[PDB]
């Protein structure tokens, strides 16, 4: 029962949630659930990042106070995650009181280590990215200043702000990345982060004067904290900071994994660790940056109205079918395309057929031909034993894949096994054998059928992280109790004589 603390990046509630958000929550819910089934004590944090201009500007364009849009749109994210069956332990909002408190304390410590200082800032702020750029990192295109990287507009900003002594931590960071090879995944993202930090870091503005929407800097009410300082702090707040001598913080911090997307990696792999080093806090163990998801182009909303609502998509296709597609279509870490044709055919071949047809055809035979009881198998032939051996070795393989955030390869391995089982079912042809008078073929019918059920049972157990309801539905159909559904149950075979209730379809769609 070792602790495992796993977090998602928290979303700006400035707009409705797109599929990219639901991708991050689903991948992380898969990891969370796998760990619970594998006997870890999981704390799973998600939520919203309610401060900053980006949110304040969306409020004024609506014609409403900022805190109103914050609570309303935060509820939409929360309700969306309920629908997608995200098993978060806490949903953190940055307006929360204890969060305000956690941030003040983090600042107090960075002050107390001599890493915050007042100075004049001049430069370009992108409200859409909540982030500063130097003039070199912007282009003038038809009389409009856009960032070179993202193509987003920028604002000239002259203010007096508190800075963080980020340049002091360049080599301590490089030391850390070197000593902890698995701190940043995937490996492509690691070498990018190492490139940037080797170029040298400049000090970082961490307060704002021009607006009041945010956590006030302690002993300087005239300032609010840069939204990213307070936002990163949510991970500390999710484990009971500032009370560092509490059960939660002692148990769960340091976080075992931050799931984020590749655009916010610098905040998590450079700025966040430096703040923590400054404040004398233990760093997180690992950061996995997942790739973007397109609609044949990045989803642009207004530029191209090609957004994909995951709640619509979940009602359109089923929650579990969407969670399977997102974790199967794309290799986790790389960029990928969503398309309406790709998902339907994926759901059709992988779930409707390879999995669900195999289950219905075996579970129906049990109901018709065997009085709805699990059969007693005899001596397993070599083809039976080879199928049972691949399936008995899945838990180890899938476990390895989940520990590198390669959920896609776990699913591939589980489906290569199902593909063997279908071929096995075709070549053993039990539909022939059930209609026979000799007791040899009747025992042989009972054996083949038992194997197919025992294989499907294993698949169901291992698919619980990705498809909780549909996995559970199959385990119901195989007569499994509510205490025989953890990964310990993978090792314990399907007992002959169990009553299987009358087959209903797992994927009515
Ligand atoms: C202390 S963390 C605060 C983070 C900050 N609050 C923030 O970044 O706000 P956010 O609401 O835009 O968060 C979006 C998250 O979803 C991913 N993402 C977004 N769109 C995506 C897409 N189309 N495809 C794939 N991934 C996507 C993206 O990488 C990011 O991780």
Curated annotation (Swiss-Prot):
<keyword id="KW-0963">Cytoplasm</keyword>
<dbReference type="InterPro" id="IPR014729">
    <property type="entry name" value="Rossmann-like_a/b/a_fold"/>
</dbReference>
<dbReference type="Pfam" id="PF19303">
    <property type="entry name" value="Anticodon_3"/>
</dbReference>
<dbReference type="GO" id="GO:0005524">
    <property type="term" value="F:ATP binding"/>
</dbReference>
<comment type="similarity">
    <text>Belongs to the class-I aminoacyl-tRNA synthetase family. MetG type 2B subfamily.</text>
</comment>
<comment type="function">
    <text>Is required not only for elongation of protein synthesis but also for the initiation of all mRNA translation through initiator tRNA(fMet) aminoacylation.</text>
</comment>
<dbReference type="GO" id="GO:0005737">
    <property type="term" value="C:cytoplasm"/>
</dbReference>
<dbReference type="InterPro" id="IPR014758">
    <property type="entry name" value="Met-tRNA_synth"/>
</dbReference>
<protein>
    <recommendedName>
        <fullName>Methionine--tRNA ligase</fullName>
        <ecNumber>6.1.1.10</ecNumber>
    </recommendedName>
</protein>
<dbReference type="InterPro" id="IPR015413">
    <property type="entry name" value="Methionyl/Leucyl_tRNA_Synth"/>
</dbReference>
<keyword id="KW-0030">Aminoacyl-tRNA synthetase</keyword>
<feature type="short sequence motif" description="'HIGH' region">
    <location>
        <begin position="11"/>
        <end position="21"/>
    </location>
</feature>
<feature type="binding site">
    <location>
        <position position="302"/>
    </location>
    <ligand>
        <name>ATP</name>
    </ligand>
</feature>
<dbReference type="Pfam" id="PF09334">
    <property type="entry name" value="tRNA-synt_1g"/>
</dbReference>
<keyword id="KW-0648">Protein biosynthesis</keyword>
<dbReference type="InterPro" id="IPR041872">
    <property type="entry name" value="Anticodon_Met"/>
</dbReference>
<feature type="short sequence motif" description="'KMSKS' region">
    <location>
        <begin position="299"/>
        <end position="303"/>
    </location>
</feature>
<dbReference type="GO" id="GO:0005886">
    <property type="term" value="C:plasma membrane"/>
</dbReference>
<dbReference type="InterPro" id="IPR033911">
    <property type="entry name" value="MetRS_core"/>
</dbReference>
<comment type="subunit">
    <text>Monomer.</text>
</comment>
<dbReference type="GO" id="GO:0004825">
    <property type="term" value="F:methionine-tRNA ligase activity"/>
</dbReference>
<dbReference type="GO" id="GO:0006431">
    <property type="term" value="P:methionyl-tRNA aminoacylation"/>
</dbReference>
<keyword id="KW-0067">ATP-binding</keyword>
<dbReference type="InterPro" id="IPR023457">
    <property type="entry name" value="Met-tRNA_synth_2"/>
</dbReference>
<dbReference type="InterPro" id="IPR009080">
    <property type="entry name" value="tRNAsynth_Ia_anticodon-bd"/>
</dbReference>
<keyword id="KW-0547">Nucleotide-binding</keyword>
<keyword id="KW-0436">Ligase</keyword>
<dbReference type="InterPro" id="IPR001412">
    <property type="entry name" value="aa-tRNA-synth_I_CS"/>
</dbReference>
């Amino acid at each position: 029962m070792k602790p495992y603390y796993v977090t998602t990046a928290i979303a700006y509630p400035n707009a409705a949630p797109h599929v990219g958000h639901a991708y991050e929550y689903i991948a992380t819910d898969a990891i969370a659930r796998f760990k619970r089934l594998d006997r870890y004590d999981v704390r799973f944090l998600t939520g919203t990042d309610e401060h900053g201009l980006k949110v304040a500007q969306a409020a004024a364009a609506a014609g409403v106070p900022t805190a109103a849009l914050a609570r309303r749109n935060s509820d939409v994210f929360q309700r969306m995650q309920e629908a997608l069956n995200i098993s978060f332990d806490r949903f953190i909002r940055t307006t929360d009181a204890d969060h305000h408190e956690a941030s003040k304390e983090l600042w107090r410590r960075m002050s107390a280590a001599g890493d915050i200082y007042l100075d004049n800032y001049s430069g370009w702020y992108s409200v859409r990215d909540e982030r500063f750029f130097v003039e070199s990192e912007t282009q003038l295109v038809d009389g409009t200043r856009l960032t070179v990287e993202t193509g987003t507009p920028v604002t000239w900003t002259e203010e007096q702000t508190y800075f963080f002594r980020l340049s002091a931590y360049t080599d301590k960071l490089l030391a850390h990345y070197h000593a902890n090879p698995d701190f940043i995944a995937p490996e492509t993202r690691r070498n990018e982060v190492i490139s940037f930090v080797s170029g040298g870091l400049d000090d970082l503005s961490i307060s704002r004067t021009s607006f009041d929407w945010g956590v006030q800097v302690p002993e300087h009410p005239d300032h609010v904290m840069y939204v990213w300082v307070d936002a990163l702090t949510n991970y500390l707040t999710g484990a009971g900071f500032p009370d560092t001598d509490s059960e939660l913080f002692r148990r769960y911090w340091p976080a075992d994994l931050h799931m984020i997307g590749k655009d916010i990696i610098r905040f998590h792999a450079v700025y966040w660790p430096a703040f923590l080093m400054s404040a004398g806090i233990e760093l997180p163990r690992r950061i996995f940056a997942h790739g973007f998801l397109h609609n044949r182009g990045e989803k642009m909303s207004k530029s191209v109205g090609n957004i994909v609502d995951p709640v619509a998509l979940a009602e359109a296709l089923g929650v579990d079918q969407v969670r399977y597609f997102l974790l199967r279509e794309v290799p986790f870490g790389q960029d990928g395309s969503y398309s309406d044709e790709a998902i339907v055919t994926r759901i059709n071949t992988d779930l409707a057929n390879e999995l669900g047809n195999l289950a219905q055809r075996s579970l129906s035979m049990v109901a018709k031909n065997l009085d709805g009881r699990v059969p007693n198998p005899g001596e397993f032939a070599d083809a039976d034993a080879a199928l049972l051996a691949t399936a008995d070795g899945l838990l180890e393989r899938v476990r390895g894949h989940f520990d590198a955030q390669a959920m896609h390869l776990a699913l591939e391995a589980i489906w290569l096994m199902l593909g063997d089982a279908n071929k096995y079912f075709s070549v053993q042809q039990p539909w022939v054998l059930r209609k026979s008078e000799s007791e040899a073929d009747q025992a042989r019918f009972r054996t083949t059928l038992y194997v197919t059920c025992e294989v499907v049972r294993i698949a169901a157990l291992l698919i619980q992280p990705v498809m909780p309801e549909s996995a559970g539905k199959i385990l119901d159909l195989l007569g499994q109790a509510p205490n025989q559904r953890s990964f310990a149950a993978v090792g314990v075979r399907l007992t002959p004589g169990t009553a299987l209730p009358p087959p209903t379809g797992v994927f009515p769609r």
